[PDB]
Amino acid sequence: NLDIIGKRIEKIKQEHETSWHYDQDHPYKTWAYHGSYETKASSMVNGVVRLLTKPWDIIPMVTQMAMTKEKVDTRTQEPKEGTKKLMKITAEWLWKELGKKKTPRMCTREEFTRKVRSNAALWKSAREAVEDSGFWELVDKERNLHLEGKCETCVYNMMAIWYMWLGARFLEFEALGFLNEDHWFSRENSLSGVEGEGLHKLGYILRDVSKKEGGAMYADDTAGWDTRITLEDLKNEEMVTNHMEGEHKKLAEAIFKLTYQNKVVRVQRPTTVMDIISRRDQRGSGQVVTYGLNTFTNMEAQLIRQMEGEGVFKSIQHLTVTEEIAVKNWLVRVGRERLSRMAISGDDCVVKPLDDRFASALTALNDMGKVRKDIQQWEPSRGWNDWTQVPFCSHHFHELIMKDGRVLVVPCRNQDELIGRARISQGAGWSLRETACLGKSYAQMWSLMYFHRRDLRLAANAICSAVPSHWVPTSRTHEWMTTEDMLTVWNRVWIQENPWMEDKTPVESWEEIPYLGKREDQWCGSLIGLTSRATWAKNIQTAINQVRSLIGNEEYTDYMPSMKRFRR
Ligand SMILES: Nc1cccnc1-n1cccc1
Ligand SMILES: Nc1cccnc1-n1cccc1
Ligand SMILES: [Cl-]
Ligand SMILES: [Zn+2]
Numbered sequence: 168n169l170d171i172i173g174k175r176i177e178k179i180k181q182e183h184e185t186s187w188h189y190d191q192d193h194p195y196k197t198w199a200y201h202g203s204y205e206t207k208a209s210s211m212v213n214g215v216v217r218l219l220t221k222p223w224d225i226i227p228m229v230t231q232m233a234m235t236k237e238k239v240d241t242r243t244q245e246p247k248e249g250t251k252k253l254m255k256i257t258a259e260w261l262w263k264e265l266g267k268k269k270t271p272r273m274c275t276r277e278e279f280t281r282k283v284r285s286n287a288a289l290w291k292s293a294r295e296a297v298e299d300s301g302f303w304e305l306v307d308k309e310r311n312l313h314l315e316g317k318c319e320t321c322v323y324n325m326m327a328i329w330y331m332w333l334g335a336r337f338l339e340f341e342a343l344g345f346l347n348e349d350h351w352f353s354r355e356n357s358l359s360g361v362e363g364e365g366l367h368k369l370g371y372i373l374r375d376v377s378k379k380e381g382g383a384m385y386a387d388d389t390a391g392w393d394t395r396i397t398l399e400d401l402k403n404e405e406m407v408t409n410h411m412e413g414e415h416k417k418l419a420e421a422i423f424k425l426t427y428q429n430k431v432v433r434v435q436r437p438t439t440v441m442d443i444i445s446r447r448d449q450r451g452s453g454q455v456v457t458y459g460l461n462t463f464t465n466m467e468a469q470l471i472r473q474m475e476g477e478g479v480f481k482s483i484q485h486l487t488v489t490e491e492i493a494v495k496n497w498l499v500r501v502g503r504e505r506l507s508r509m510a511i512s513g514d515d516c517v518v519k520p521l522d523d524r525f526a527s528a529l530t531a532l533n534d535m536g537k538v539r540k541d542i543q544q545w546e547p548s549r550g551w552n553d554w555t556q557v558p559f560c561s562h563h564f565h566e567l568i569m570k571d572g573r574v575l576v577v578p579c580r581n582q583d584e585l586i587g588r589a590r591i592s593q594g595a596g597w598s599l600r601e602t603a604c605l606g607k608s609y610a611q612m613w614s615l616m617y618f619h620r621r622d623l624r625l626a627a628n629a630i631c632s633a634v635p636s637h638w639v640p641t642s643r644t645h646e647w648m649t650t651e652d653m654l655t656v657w658n659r660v661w662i663q664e665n666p667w668m669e670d671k672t673p674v675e676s677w678e679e680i681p682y683l684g685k686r687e688d689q690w691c692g693s694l695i696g697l698t699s700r701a702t703w704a705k706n707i708q709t710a711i712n713q714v715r716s717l718i719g720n721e722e723y724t725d726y727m728p729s730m731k732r733f734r735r
């Protein structure tokens with residue numbers, strides 16, 4: 168406890184020694200409180216996307232999205248010894264499989280610097296600190312302190328997103344960045360994972376899982392996954408260090424011990440004082456390490472749920488000596504096959520188990536604290552009989568046959584959600600040019616991922632017609648972030664580079680690229696058939712001209728005649 172976090176706490180105490188006060192009216196039960204001190208971000212609308220989607224101005228599901236804890240301050244119980252054993256055996260085996268064709272390695276100041284230049288989500292800005300050299304001296308001090316087994320400045324800031332100072336992020340990136348930078352959770356490497364795979368590949372992956380013999384597809388969400396990470400989970404995650412050596416092992420061990428398995432956080436409370444609180448359990452790391460370790464622990468949880476359904480062990484209360492031999496031998500004999508029956512993206516999963524015994528195999532899942540969302544604790548899971556109805560990564564997936572017989576598996580979600588998000592820009596000081604270029608990024612994403620939705624292909628063509636042809640899409644895989652012809656990009660992604668497409672014959676026109684059935688488009692939220700939508704489509708050039716007149720005398724390209732109706 169206080170020996171590991173005290174130094175961090177002792178340092179913040181002094182930088183505010185003229186405000187420190189052990190407040191007796193503090194709202195924490197499960198978080199340890201240490202003291203307070205005196206201290207003191209809305210969704211803006213994207214005017215270019217909103218002027219080109221007028222029919223949606225009167226649709227509350229779109230317009231309410233731009234307007235405007237219980238779970239964080241809860242406690243998870245210690246799993247039983249059978250559960251703790253199931254996890255340790257499974258984790259040990261999983262780090263070895265993930266490590267068979269990969270080498271753990273430190274990420275570098277050079278790599279870290281390149282990422283800060285490219286606007287990755289990780290002195291005014293980071294760019295400046297990286298150029299400066301005192302920062303790196305500060306980094307060096309902490310780094311040598313971590314080699315000593317002590318921490319001074321690796322403190323979280325709550326807002327649930329856990330901002331640290333850039334120096335702490337580098338030390339995180341140094342030891343643990345390899346998980347993401349070297350694609351440990353790629354499908355090729357982890358078999359369950361989809362890291363780097365892209366939204367145009369997730370549907371094909373779900374359809375490949377569907378091809379396996381077995382029961383329903385299960386897609387159970389965990390209620391507040393990050394808050395249900397136990398200290399036993401953090402200790403199985405720490406076992407990645409068993410595969411490291413030299414400095415790297417030491418540095419990785421310090422991240423896990425000092426920043427993950429012990430945490431110090433500063434919270435804005437309005438009553439305005441800053442609460443220096445600590446706790447051991449729960450997920451609190453950087454987003455990228457959070458994504459990879461969530462994937463890891465989810466793959467582990469789901470293999471164990473699969474073991475329970477298949478009768479590999481009888482009870483979580485305690486594993487017999489022989490049951491350990493059985494688990495290990497299961498993992499050795501069928502482990503890789505069982506991983507291939509899953510698609511796991513952080514806390515999000517789809518599992519096609521051997522049979523439907525999986526549906527009521529709930530003792531390990533509940534005892535690990537991975538409690539299902541929106542279903543009673545002991546009520547069996549409801550599975551999906553058709554891969555095209557399975558939810559994954561906020562989407563479902565359609566099978567769409569081209570006029571030439573080739574098969575597209577395309578991503579889809581309710582259209583209100585897509586238009587509502589396109590109409591929102593985060594941050595201050597956006598110029599008209601920067602707002603336009605963000606609208607162009609949404610438009611090009613729609614042309615590539617959602618071309619099959621009538622409204623989005625028409626709105627995408629309108630935004631690309633309204634924004635100067637050579638302006639570069641911005642956002643403060645992502646193939647839509649380019650100035651290349653979207654037809655050329657479409658042909659690369661869907662035909663040339665698509666391993667599910669045998670016939671590589673290029674498409675020569677947007678008109679060869681199909682839509683969903685008209686009824687299926689309305690089911691997924693299309694306005695096709697409404698008078699508002701008909702007036703919008705008929706008069707689109709008037710909307711395009713409005714936005715061109717606001718931006719001014721620039722070079723523009725008409726993309727509307729790419730669609731049959733506007734082709735005279
Ligand atoms: N790759 C990585 C590792 C550790 C922390 N942060 C990152 N990151 C976040 C956005 C882009 C890169
Ligand atoms: N992957 C995902 C999840 C939630 C929202 N949007 C996305 N997306 C849309 C296009 C590409 C990615
Ligand atoms: Cl179904
Ligand atoms: Zn530190």
Ligand SMILES: [Zn+2]
Pocket residue numbers: 563565579580691
């Ligand atoms: Zn759909």
